[PDB]
Write a protein that binds this ligand. Sequence first.
Ligand SMILES: [K+]
Ligand SMILES: [K+]
Ligand SMILES: [K+]
Ligand SMILES: [K+]
Ligand SMILES: [K+]
Ligand SMILES: [Mg+2]
Ligand SMILES: [Mg+2]
Ligand SMILES: [Mg+2]
Ligand SMILES: [Mg+2]
Ligand SMILES: [Mg+2]
Ligand SMILES: [Mg+2]
Ligand SMILES: [Mg+2]
Ligand SMILES: [Mg+2]
Ligand SMILES: [Mg+2]
Ligand SMILES: [Mg+2]
Ligand SMILES: [Mg+2]
Ligand SMILES: [Mg+2]
Ligand SMILES: [Mg+2]
Ligand SMILES: [Mg+2]
Ligand SMILES: [Mg+2]
Ligand SMILES: [Mg+2]
Ligand SMILES: [Mg+2]
Ligand SMILES: [Mg+2]
Ligand SMILES: [Mg+2]
Ligand SMILES: [Mg+2]
Ligand SMILES: [Mg+2]
Ligand SMILES: [Mg+2]
Ligand SMILES: [Mg+2]
Ligand SMILES: [Mg+2]
Ligand SMILES: [Mg+2]
Ligand SMILES: [Mg+2]
Ligand SMILES: [Mg+2]
Ligand SMILES: [Mg+2]
Ligand SMILES: [Mg+2]
Ligand SMILES: [Mg+2]
Ligand SMILES: [Mg+2]
Ligand SMILES: [Mg+2]
Ligand SMILES: [Mg+2]
Ligand SMILES: [Mg+2]
Ligand SMILES: [Mg+2]
Ligand SMILES: [Mg+2]
Ligand SMILES: [Mg+2]
Ligand SMILES: [Mg+2]
Ligand SMILES: [Mg+2]
Ligand code: NA
Ligand code: NA
Ligand code: NA
Ligand code: NA
Ligand code: NA
Ligand code: NA
Lengths: 64, 146, 208, 113
Amino acid sequence: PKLKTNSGAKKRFALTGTGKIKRKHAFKSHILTKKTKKQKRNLTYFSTVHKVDENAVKQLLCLR
Amino acid sequence: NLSSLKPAEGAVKSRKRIGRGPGSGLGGTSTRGHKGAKSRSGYSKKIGFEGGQMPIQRRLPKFGFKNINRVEYKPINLSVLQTLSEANLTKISVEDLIAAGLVSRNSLVKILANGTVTTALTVEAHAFSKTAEEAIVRAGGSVVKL
Amino acid sequence: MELSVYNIKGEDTGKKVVLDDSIFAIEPNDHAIYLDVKQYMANQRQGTHKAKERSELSGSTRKLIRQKGSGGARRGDINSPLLSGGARVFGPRPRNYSFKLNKKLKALARRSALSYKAKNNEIIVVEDFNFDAPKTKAFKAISAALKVGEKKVLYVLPEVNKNVYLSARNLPNTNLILANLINTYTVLASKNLVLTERSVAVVNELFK
Amino acid sequence: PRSVNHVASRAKRKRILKLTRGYFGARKNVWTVAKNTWEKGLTYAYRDRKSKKRNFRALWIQRINAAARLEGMSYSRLMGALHANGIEINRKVLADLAMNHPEAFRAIVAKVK
RNA sequence: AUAGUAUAUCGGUAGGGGAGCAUUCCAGCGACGUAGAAGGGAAAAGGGCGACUUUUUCUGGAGUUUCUGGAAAAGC
RNA sequence: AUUGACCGAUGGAGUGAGGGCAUGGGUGCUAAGGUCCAUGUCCGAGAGGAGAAGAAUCCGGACCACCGGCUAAGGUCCCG
RNA sequence: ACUGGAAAGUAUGGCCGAAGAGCAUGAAAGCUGCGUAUCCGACAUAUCGAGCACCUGAGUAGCGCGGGACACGAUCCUGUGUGAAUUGGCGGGGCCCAUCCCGUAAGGCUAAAUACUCCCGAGAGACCGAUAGUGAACCAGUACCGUGAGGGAAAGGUGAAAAGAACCUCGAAAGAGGAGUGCAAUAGACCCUGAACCCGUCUGCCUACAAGCGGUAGGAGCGCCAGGUGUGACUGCGUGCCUUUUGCAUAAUGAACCUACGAGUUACUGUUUGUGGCAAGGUUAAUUGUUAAGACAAGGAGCCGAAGCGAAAGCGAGUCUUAAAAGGGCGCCAGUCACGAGCAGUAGACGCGAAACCAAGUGAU
RNA sequence: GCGGGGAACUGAAACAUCUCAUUACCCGUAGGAGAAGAAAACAAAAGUGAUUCCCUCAGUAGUGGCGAGCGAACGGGGAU
RNA sequence: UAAGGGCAGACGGUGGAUGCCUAGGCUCUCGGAGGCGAAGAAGGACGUGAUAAGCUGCGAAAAGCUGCGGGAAUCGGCACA
Ligand SMILES: [K+]
Ligand SMILES: [K+]
Ligand SMILES: [K+]
Ligand SMILES: [K+]
Ligand SMILES: [K+]
Ligand SMILES: [Mg+2]
Ligand SMILES: [Mg+2]
Ligand SMILES: [Mg+2]
Ligand SMILES: [Mg+2]
Ligand SMILES: [Mg+2]
Ligand SMILES: [Mg+2]
Ligand SMILES: [Mg+2]
Ligand SMILES: [Mg+2]
Ligand SMILES: [Mg+2]
Ligand SMILES: [Mg+2]
Ligand SMILES: [Mg+2]
Ligand SMILES: [Mg+2]
Ligand SMILES: [Mg+2]
Ligand SMILES: [Mg+2]
Ligand SMILES: [Mg+2]
Ligand SMILES: [Mg+2]
Ligand SMILES: [Mg+2]
Ligand SMILES: [Mg+2]
Ligand SMILES: [Mg+2]
Ligand SMILES: [Mg+2]
Ligand SMILES: [Mg+2]
Ligand SMILES: [Mg+2]
Ligand SMILES: [Mg+2]
Ligand SMILES: [Mg+2]
Ligand SMILES: [Mg+2]
Ligand SMILES: [Mg+2]
Ligand SMILES: [Mg+2]
Ligand SMILES: [Mg+2]
Ligand SMILES: [Mg+2]
Ligand SMILES: [Mg+2]
Ligand SMILES: [Mg+2]
Ligand SMILES: [Mg+2]
Ligand SMILES: [Mg+2]
Ligand SMILES: [Mg+2]
Ligand SMILES: [Mg+2]
Ligand SMILES: [Mg+2]
Ligand SMILES: [Mg+2]
Ligand SMILES: [Mg+2]
Ligand SMILES: [Mg+2]
Ligand code: NA
Ligand code: NA
Ligand code: NA
Ligand code: NA
Ligand code: NA
Ligand code: NA
């Protein structure tokens, strides 16, 4: 049958123009005052999935 | 000529066949290694599994929302308008754009500014970028949003 | 390419016909021919073959002997493939063998075979003929008069011609086809190709 | 279609069983015993092709030693005198000359002694 | 393998890659068979190498097969 | 200087029970064919020769054939 | 005419064909037989206007409490307790209100396009061919096993034709030797062919002072038929194979032997790649028409490519971040459809193997 | 086919929500088919009008110890 | 030398592989049909022959009885004598 997309991956990742995968950063949810502003600003940015994990993320999204 | 058919070189290839002796280099363990989960019949990969450590599709948060009234425009750039007109035209329109296979029938068109539109044209599109509209009007054209 | 036209008695009438150059004088694509013939034979297949797997055997699922203590090899149920009269593992299953070829690919392979015929000089154009009644001896005369009767020959006809079909049916090395249902396999399956002067016009408009 | 290579499968066994004729007991005709014995024998033959060159050179030297000693000279001193004089006759030729043509051997000795 | 005959290289388990043989059936062009087919016994000869192939003779008494392509119930 | 041994992209893996020896160490009793690390090496996945017979000590990396020659470690009274 | 036990074979020379499908006949038959193409046939039986406010479905719609179905852990159903209005009405448009739009619950009936095969008729297969294919080609759900529910085999072939061996010899007769039939009896009833393991007899060479995975490399003599073949006095070297292991002659695992059987397959959805078609475009799906399942022609719906950035509104070779900018992030500065192949997931998914769990029955001989 | 009842092994690499599955199985009862069926319907100022079945839409919108998983409709193209 | 044994060959025994073959299977396509039964069904028991175990057919009218249509020399089922 048809391949099924993982429901959690399709709410956490996105594709870019050249094929890289967009992602958010962790450690940004609730324990915030003790962290530095530089740390929090770096964590607020979007990032890309690492090369060693692209295969697993693509399998989760059905090679998308 | 059915007695002398031949396919192109390198077009057909024999399939791999495992577990049929030592000379093939694929017998015995038949490419599976020695023991463990991966050697058994019926093993399949658990796609998100990482051995028990919290997987990447769980360590990371969800983000965003999808708008149920989103509007998307098919981008038709400036250099296409001058190319199509000269090839085939001095008044471009959606029904003409569809007739030349450049856009589907039920699709909305916005004109952008990637190129030059030197030829003087009257243009009927659903949407126009600020720079794209100025490019036509400067080149002695007309812009009709409809 | 223009060819002379003969009558039933196999005598040139001076009248000539022209063959479209885009149909009969291209460079043949031999890989296109290979794929069209492979597809034709696959579409003729009827894959009605089957052997019984383990879940299809008539034996009971009961465990034959207790797991430990018997002194022999451990055994489950009577349908095991290791047993005499047991399950057949990975046997035939009913299959559909058809596959797709692009429409433009099939058109090119039709032209390559006709080009091969035109190049090997195995194309005869004969004037259109119709019999009053079915007679196998009548149709043998045309083949003997055209000097194509000792090897497989294909007759291309433009219309039904029921009388002609019945006259040529009993003869071993004779094949009849309609000019609009021409395919690659049937062209290459006969040494000689006999076109009627009205089948040329049909082919020229259709397979251009 | 169903494919079973009965004739071919059985022909492979029959060819090898011709090679195991002459063996002791079940090693000549019982298939899994005979094939085991034949395969082990082929390993011996690869090793014994090499040892043949060792055994035949040792036999040439022993015969040369006896022939030289009848003319008051050991093998080591005779060989040292030949290599000093540039004589390139090999040990197989000299041993043959020692055994079957003793007068020619005596001329080689008389040239270096 | 590189350069187009020269230089280098050729021990191998897990494992990756390349190139082939045999088997059953199909299409096409063709062959063989009661003046003896398949199968079975014996012998001889071949292959860069091999999986294997060919010939002769006895038995046997009716089917068998080259090449090119195609598909597998395709090898203990 | 170096037969080219390095890296990127992308298809396919296996492995994730190691072991001996030498050197530097911890632990143990300055015991263990013990145990835990580091640096090499060999066995693993490596045949041939010497050591009487020994996985890793000494010499040495097997494309095939040869009733040719030179050597290594180690030897040259006989078995040899 | 030849070969042959027997022509249908082979070589000549004819003929029919709307019939050159096939099966049978002493070998392989268009012209020997039954048939085939085509045409013709049933006594039976079977089937085929204005106004007006009168009406328009009640324990119903709706509601509380507890459950169920909807893709779903507003809409639909209801066990329990309640409970409207009436065309200016009532219900729905994903809490809810307003407006607008759509529709008329609490009555009912309806062909086609869809699902299936105990069965009848006509066909087919790059399906099996007697340890295969149904458990069952024969006798089969039989024999046999079980109190019962239930479980459940093995087993095809003389020959063209029984012409299935009158009669004799040895034997008390079982068995054979002959005779005869036959192309063949080493086709003689367990009968086509007739392999291996296993078992005999004969002939040739070796063997009673000799000690280890049984071979391998040398090497006399002897025996047969011109240098081939059988044997092997004597000599050198040599602790099977598989699997599992750091490491096995291992006193770790495994097999009596032979013949036969026995384990990465297929479908669908992706992805990479070898080979092709078309190319800023590529490609049809269901289905339809003609012809006679295939073949040819239609079918552009949809899908991918063609612009990105942003959570989004939205801007656009830019965009987001900023009060703005600079900086910075992401972008800008040949695809598509197939064929073959590798791999992945879903299916039992390379094969054999549990202890167990659940449902419906059978048993207190 | 339509009704009445209704598991567990298994997956979640444990397991209770969830899954297996409105399956297996048991019972009742039609027909050549059955069920459905003629809007108290969809839609979104643009429109289509009974039911059924196929191709798409789409592994999408959603749902979910937001885990494993589950998974539409509108619209378009057909059969009738 | 050979009580015995080893190897090779020749000829046999046993056994029933292999090759060839088919009488039975397997998967489907097209068309039809989709029931039988109180006027007693499905499924059975017992019988039934010149001869008669078992199957088949039949039912004390018992391998069968009467008409109508077909067809033309053999026939009393498998199945002999
Ligand atoms: K944990
Ligand atoms: K055959
Ligand atoms: K025999
Ligand atoms: K002796
Ligand atoms: K043990
Ligand atoms: Mg927050
Ligand atoms: Mg390997
Ligand atoms: Mg192995
Ligand atoms: Mg293993
Ligand atoms: Mg392990
Ligand atoms: Mg592993
Ligand atoms: Mg298992
Ligand atoms: Mg069971
Ligand atoms: Mg079977
Ligand atoms: Mg297979
Ligand atoms: Mg080397
Ligand atoms: Mg190598
Ligand atoms: Mg097999
Ligand atoms: Mg580990
Ligand atoms: Mg470890
Ligand atoms: Mg240790
Ligand atoms: Mg230490
Ligand atoms: Mg240890
Ligand atoms: Mg090494
Ligand atoms: Mg609303
Ligand atoms: Mg059977
Ligand atoms: Mg015979
Ligand atoms: Mg026989
Ligand atoms: Mg002594
Ligand atoms: Mg151990
Ligand atoms: Mg290992
Ligand atoms: Mg050892
Ligand atoms: Mg022992
Ligand atoms: Mg064990
Ligand atoms: Mg044992
Ligand atoms: Mg053992
Ligand atoms: Mg064994
Ligand atoms: Mg065995
Ligand atoms: Mg679990
Ligand atoms: Mg009924
Ligand atoms: Mg209906
Ligand atoms: Mg024999
Ligand atoms: Mg047989
Ligand atoms: Mg009458
Ligand atoms: Na292996
Ligand atoms: Na013969
Ligand atoms: Na076998
Ligand atoms: Na900026
Ligand atoms: Na003797
Ligand atoms: Na009566």
